[PDB]
Structures are given as structure tokens and as C-alpha cells.
Structure 1
Amino acid sequence: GNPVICMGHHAVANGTMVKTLADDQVEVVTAQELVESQNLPELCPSPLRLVDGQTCDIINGALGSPGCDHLNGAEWDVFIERPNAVDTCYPFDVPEYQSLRSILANNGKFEFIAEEFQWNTVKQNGKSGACKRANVNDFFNRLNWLVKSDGNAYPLQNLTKINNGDYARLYIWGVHHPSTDTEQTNLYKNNPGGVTVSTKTSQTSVVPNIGSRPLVRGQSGRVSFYWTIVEPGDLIVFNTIGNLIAPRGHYKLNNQKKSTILNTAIPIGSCVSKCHTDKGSLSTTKPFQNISRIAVGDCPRYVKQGSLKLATGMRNIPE
């Protein structure tokens, strides 16, 4: 009665600590990290379709400000908006800015359908020094600045665009706020002005607000931009006695809107990834990440923990 057989298990010199229900630090033979804490220093242009706005944010892109011509016809899964983007035109605001930005970004393309508006008597294509294009006074190339005729006339405008296409139309238009009563009359004769844009079931009415604003690119006036969506089987009516910044057409809206926008200064590179944060793309399989709450695409879920180790082996008890 002398031979002996022993049953046992493997071990390593130095294992990895993991958490359980009952212990914050248990040494196991092998483990796998579930939190991704590294990012790429660049944005991957594949397999998602990225469009770099460069010096234009998505709002000035849509208005057609100087320097945004490269965005014409662009299509994107993710619009890349740059923090150092700058205004290069007449000073403006958008009462529901984030909402318009959301719509443009979500839609995912800049497909503009030009249209002829038969405006009456009034002069078209007004320009400004605040919006210069190659040293020449210009304006938003998607917008049409209406002013009084040489005969000092600004008659009531009353125009209709009917939509019997198979897509919803996005009309972007604006109302100009002069600095003084003089500027008001000098531009639009009538005082006060007024704009009313309406569909069958919705409407927007704006009365201009005359007053001095801070000087921006040599202007105390402001343009406030609005938008109107026109569904198939609907129609839009523009009504003005002054101060209208008219559209030159409409943007096409996709029926299905699948896109978005990402604001970051990180440059676009040559890598391949379907997950993008504002800190750069991720190339990982881990189920979680702690890099940024701002993440677009096929991404790990954002968590606060810097590390969460999944045990992939038994307890390590060496010797």
C-alpha cells in the first residue's frame, strides 16, 4: 500500500486581481479587461461616411456662407463640425438654433433644389460688406436679400410654392433687423416691415425689431433665420411688406433620417473604425469604454469605471 496519485490544478507566479460579490481583490490566473481606455488620435473615414466642415459649421454650410462651397452636395453619416469654425458673413442668429442644427445634421445631406421666385417690383440679390467674397460685397448664396425698387417702392409680396414631389421640402428663410429707422426706410421703404410664412397647418409670423446691436463686421443690424418644412400635398406661402430674406429654393429631406453631427478638433486619418468619439475613433471589441460620453456609431457603452477585469481563469495559488 504505497503508490499515490494526486489531483491538482495549474498556477502562475503572478496572477491578476478581480472583483467578485464578496471580495474586491481576488487573484486569478488570467483576466480580460472590459473597459476600453485607449483611443486613436484620429477619426476613421471608413466604413462610415465622414464630411469635414472645416471652417464652416453646419449652420453656415446650409446658409451658404463664404468658404462653405465645398459642402455643396455633400452626404454624410457623421458631419464633423470644427470648434475653430468662424462666421464669414452678415451677423445672424437662429431663435431655435439647436433645433435647426439637429434637423440639418440628422437629415444627412446638403441637396439643394433651386427655385425661381417671381418677386414683384423689389430689387433682388442685395449684398453686404460684412459678407465679402474675394473682396466683393456678397451674401448667403442660398438666400435672396429683397430691397425696395429704384422707384422707392416695396409692395406687398404674395407668392406660393406648391409641393407635389415625393419628398418633404426644407425652406430656410430670414428676417432682417435694421439698426435705425433710417436704415429701415432706406432698405424697405415701409416702416414697419413684416413677414408671414405659412403652410396649410402651420405658420410663422415675425415683426422686425429696430435697434442698435454690437458692431460685427461693420454692421449693427441682424438677420434672424427661420425654417419651414413642407410635406408632399402641402404648399407654402410667403407674405411680406418688408425685411424678408428670401430663399432661393429648398433642401431635400430624406424620408428616413439616420445621420448625426460630431463636434471635435481631432483630424481625419486613414484608419478603419465604426466608433467615433470627440476624442477620436475607437478600435476595440471591449463592451465598455471610459473615454467619452460623446460617442457615435458602433461603440462600447460608456461607463465611469477606469477598469473592470473579467476573470478568464481559476484562482491563482502558486508554489
Structure 2
Amino acid sequence: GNPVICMGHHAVANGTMVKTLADDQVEVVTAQELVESQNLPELCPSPLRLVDGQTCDIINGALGSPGCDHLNGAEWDVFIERPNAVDTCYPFDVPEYQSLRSILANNGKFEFIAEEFQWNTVKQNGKSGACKRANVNDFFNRLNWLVKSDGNAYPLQNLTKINNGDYARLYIWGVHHPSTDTEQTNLYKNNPGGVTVSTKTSQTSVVPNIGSRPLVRGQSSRVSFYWTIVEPGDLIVFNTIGNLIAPRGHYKLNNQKKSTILNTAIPIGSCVSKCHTDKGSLSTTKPFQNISRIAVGDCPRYVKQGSLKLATGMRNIPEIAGFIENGWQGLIDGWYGFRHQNAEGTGTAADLKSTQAAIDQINGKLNRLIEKTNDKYHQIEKEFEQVEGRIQDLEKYVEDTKIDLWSYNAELLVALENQHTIDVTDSEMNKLFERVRRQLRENAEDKGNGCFEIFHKCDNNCIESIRNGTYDHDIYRDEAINNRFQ
């Protein structure tokens, strides 16, 4: 009625507050941050293929403006478009600009196929002071500025290109908008001009608009650019009586389009990462991130929270007594264990089976919190210089809606996991106590503080018999029953 065996668990000086369904804050021994809030100050050039547009945005790249030559033949997973990109060529606009930019970016290559267009009588290769290369008048190198002949002729043009190849063709073409009637006739004889470009099942017809626009690189006139996709088995017809800015060929479209574009001033570095934001690449295994909604590649999901801590250990209670409202700061080789008091003295030993059982159920969630990949490339635009109305409203609402739902998911997930982690570790403690209870049977009594009073002589070999489960109560039953009740 003297030796005592106590059951307990580890503890630390002070651990980490986490969140459960019950408490807003519970202290636990260990925990892990689930939100990545650090980013690299650069973009990683591998394993994804990045192409730097440099001074050239992707639209000026497709057109072949001065300064964009480095993009001829380029192929990318991610086109890196620079906010300080500048226009170097004839002033132009693109109706549905954003859609052409999307298509070009998503296609993922600039593979241009020259074609001979046998324009009739008109002069070709018109060039401009608004589009110099090294101070020589020039023009977009994928386009061909047609003007009237020396004999003051611009006949109806009528050229067909048939696609019997195995890829869809992208043709980019334009309409010139002069500033005066005199400019219109000086360039194209006819007034008005006009352009119709058609396939079997679609058509674009454009009438030029004559008028003064703001001066840009000395020019008040403009080009408007259009595009036409021609599928295998289809064909394209160019018709004009003036003002056509003609293609010199077509771009090849990939059947599968899986690339995208990222607009950012962040330099390309030397690191390795498959996740890129507009702030730079992330190098992380965390499931969430609060760095930017703009994220391309294999990325954590964007959430609003700055921090979410996942418990990776039991409730922490610091400070002859077992578990019951003390933890053992001295237990450092296990999660649970035995502390005893007999004739030879005292000792503390870790229990492996319960310790492993807790770890398995808690490092059970550490394999599946980290497995779904979220590998995403072409998405939607998510920031905007100026308001546009209905479509931008929807783009913004869709993204806001998505972020709020994932933020909620993240919040709920961690609270649920932590509640489960606490319940599991509390349960494993109780299971250890109950295991010992069953071993002792009638040879001991519950002291109420997580300890058993053992009513018989129990030396260190006997204590160990309890700890390793070889203790036979029958050996000590007579001795114990007699000491208990008399």
C-alpha cells in the first residue's frame, strides 16, 4: 500500500495558441503555419518556361513592332509582360484588345508562317516616321501597308488563302483611319475605302473613319487591328477598296492551348519554383497563401487570413502526480509515459505504443493536408486600371466570391483538424490509463490524480513489468487484497 505508478504526458515551457470549435485560443505543444506569407523577390525560370517580353507587351510582340524581335519563335508556359512596356510603332487600337491578348497568351507561341499575297497594282511595304528602327521609317513587321500605285490606282483587291493544313491559323490584319479626306485619297485613291475579311461561316466588314485624333509620334491617323481564325478545312478571303493593313502570313495555333501571361515588374532570377505571383515566386509546401490572388502554376490557394495554425501536438499544460492537470516538462523522449515511486526510488519512462498511436493520427492529417495540387495556368484578369462596367463587375465578383469561399474553407478546416487533434491526444492519454487499470485489476486503487496506488511490494523489475505489459496480477493478488481491506 505504498508504491505508486503515475501516468502522464509531456509538456513544454510554452507552446502555441491554436483554434478549435470550442476555444478561440488553446495552447498546444507544437503547431504549424498553414498560410504562406513570404515570397521570393524574383520569378523562377524553372521548371516552367518563362518568356520576358521586356520593353514589348504581347500585343506589340504579335504585331512585330520595333524592339520585339527577341520574341520571334518564342514559346512559353508563362509570358512575362512588363508594366513599363512602351509603344514604339504606329498608333493603333484593337477592338476587343483583351480577347486578342488572351488568345495570344494562352496559345503559348509566336510561330509565324510567311505567305506570299499577290496584291494587284497597289504598292506594298508602306512605312512611317511613327515607327522607326534606329531612325529609319518602318512598320509592324507582320503587317503590310498597301497604298495606291504611282499611276493613282487602287483596284478592288480579292485574295483567298485556303487552309488544308493540320493546324488552325491566326491572321492579324488592320484598317487604316486617315485624318483628312486628302490623306484618304493621297494614300488609297478611293473614298471611302473599306475592308471585308471572311471565312465560310463568319465575316468582319470595316468602314474606315476619317478624323483628327490626338497626335502620337507625329500621327493623328490610326490603325485598328482585327483577327480571323481559320480552321483546317476553312479558308479566308481579303476584300478591300482601300485602307487595308494586310497580313504577311499567319501565326500557328496549338491545338491544345495551356499557357498564360503574367504582368509584373519582378525580375526573372535563378531559383526553382512552379508557383508564380505578380509579387514573385513562392517556394513553399503550405496549402494556403495570402500574398496575391494573382497566382499562376502549382500554387497554394489564396486566402484572406494572414495566419492559420494547425495543431501538431496535444494540449499544453506545464508543471507523485500524473496527468490530470499537470504535464511533465521532463518527459522528452515520448508523448506519454510512466512516472513511479517505489522503495528503490523514482523514475520516468516513455510509453512507445500510445506515443506512436497519437503521432500516427496527427501525422495522419499531415499527408493529406498537403496533397491536392491546385495546378492552374490561364485563368482571368484580376486587376484593372479603370472601371469598364458589366463584364469587369462580373470578373471581380467571381474572384471575390471564390476568395471568400476558400477563406471560409481554410478557417473551418483548421478549427476542425485542431479539435480532432485535441480529442485524439486526450483520448490516447485516457487509453493509456485504462490499459494500466486493466493490468493491475484488484492489486491497485485509482488515486484520482492519474496515479495508481499499488498495494504490494513493487521493485523496479516489477514496475517495468507493468510498463511493458508482462505484469501478472495473480502473483501479487493475495498480498494486495490483504493490504487493501485489512
TM-score, structure 2 normalization: 0.65
C-alpha displacement at 1:24, in angstroms? 1.3
Structure 1 Cα separation of the partners of residues 24 and 261 of structure 2: 40
Structure 1 Cα separation of the partners of residues 141 and 262 of structure 2: 25
Q: Deviation digits for residues 141-172 of structure 1, max 9, x if unmatched?
A: 00000000000000000000000000000000
C-alpha displacement at 1:281, in angstroms? 0.1
SS at match of 1:251: strand
SS at match of 1:99: helix
C-alpha displacement at 1:194, in angstroms? 0.3
Structure 1 Cα separation of the partners of residues 269 and 193 of structure 2: 50
Q: Deviation digits for residues 219-248 of structure 1, max 9, x if unmatched?
A: 000100000000000000000000000000
Q: Deviation digits for residues 254-291 of structure 1, max 9, x if unmatched?
A: 00000000000000000000000000000000000000
SS at match of 1:54: coil
Runs (4+) off by over 3 Å: none
C-alpha displacement at 1:202, in angstroms? 0.5
SS at match of 1:102: helix
C-alpha displacement at 1:207, in angstroms? 0.3
C-alpha displacement at 1:75, in angstroms? 0.3
Query: Which residue does 2:158 correspond to in 1?
Result: 158
Structure 2 Cα separation of the partners of residues 136 and 265 of structure 1: 30
Structure 2 Cα separation of the partners of residues 146 and 272 of structure 1: 48
Query: Which residue does 1:212 correspond to in 2?
Result: 212
Query: Which residue does 2:226 correspond to in 1?
Result: 226
Structure 2 Cα separation of the partners of residues 149 and 25 of structure 1: 83
C-alpha displacement at 1:317, in angstroms? 0.5
Q: Deviation digits for residues 73-102 of structure 1, max 9, x if unmatched?
A: 000000000000000000001001000000
C-alpha displacement at 1:11, in angstroms? 0.4
Structure 1 Cα separation of the partners of residues 241 and 57 of structure 2: 32
Structure 2 Cα separation of the partners of residues 14 and 217 of structure 1: 67
Is 2:10 the partner of 1:10? yes
Structure 1 Cα separation of the partners of residues 15 and 257 of structure 2: 49
C-alpha displacement at 1:25, in angstroms? 0.8
C-alpha displacement at 1:22, in angstroms? 1.5
Q: Deviation digits for residues 28-61 of structure 1, max 9, x if unmatched?
A: 0000100000000000000000000000000000
1:58-137 → structure 2 map (5 Å cutoff): 58-137=58-137
Query: Which residue does 1:316 correspond to in 2?
Result: 316
The share of aligned pairs that are identical, in percent, is 99
Structure 1 Cα separation of the partners of residues 22 and 120 of structure 2: 81
Structure 2 Cα separation of the partners of residues 177 and 2 of structure 1: 105
Q: Deviation digits for residues 93-119 of structure 1, max 9, x if unmatched?
A: 100100000000000000000000000
Q: Deviation digits for residues 173-206 of structure 1, max 9, x if unmatched?
A: 0000001111100000000000000000011000
C-alpha displacement at 1:135, in angstroms? 0.9
Structure 2 Cα separation of the partners of residues 17 and 173 of structure 1: 62
Question: Higher relative CO (CA 8 A, sep ≥ 6), structure 1 or 2?
Answer: 1
Structure 2 Cα separation of the partners of residues 315 and 193 of structure 1: 81
Structure 2 Cα separation of the partners of residues 121 and 43 of structure 1: 51
C-alpha displacement at 1:124, in angstroms? 0.1
C-alpha displacement at 1:14, in angstroms? 0.9
SS at match of 1:297: strand
C-alpha displacement at 1:63, in angstroms? 0.1
SS at match of 1:171: strand
SS at match of 2:164: coil
Structure 2 Cα separation of the partners of residues 285 and 274 of structure 1: 11
Structure 2 Cα separation of the partners of residues 55 and 213 of structure 1: 25
SS at match of 1:173: strand
Q: Deviation digits for residues 106-143 of structure 1, max 9, x if unmatched?
A: 00000000000000000000000000011110000000
C-alpha displacement at 1:251, in angstroms? 0.2
Structure 2 Cα separation of the partners of residues 180 and 14 of structure 1: 80
Structure 2 Cα separation of the partners of residues 183 and 22 of structure 1: 78
For structure 2, list consecutive stretches of 5 or more residues without a partner in the other structure. Answer: 319-485
C-alpha displacement at 1:23, in angstroms? 1.3
Structure 2 Cα separation of the partners of residues 267 and 301 of structure 1: 23
Q: Which has the higher strand share?
A: 1
C-alpha displacement at 1:249, in angstroms? 0.0
TM-score, structure 1 normalization: 0.99
SS at match of 1:8: strand
SS at match of 1:144: strand
Structure 1 Cα separation of the partners of residues 10 and 266 of structure 2: 47
SS at match of 1:122: coil
State which structure, 1 or 2, has the greater radius of gyration over its C-alpha atoms: 2
Query: Which residue does 1:203 correspond to in 2?
Result: 203
Structure 2 Cα separation of the partners of residues 301 and 99 of structure 1: 26
Structure 2 Cα separation of the partners of residues 154 and 91 of structure 1: 24
Q: Count matched residues.
A: 319
Structure 1 Cα separation of the partners of residues 21 and 238 of structure 2: 67
SS at match of 2:105: helix
Structure 1 Cα separation of the partners of residues 247 and 95 of structure 2: 18
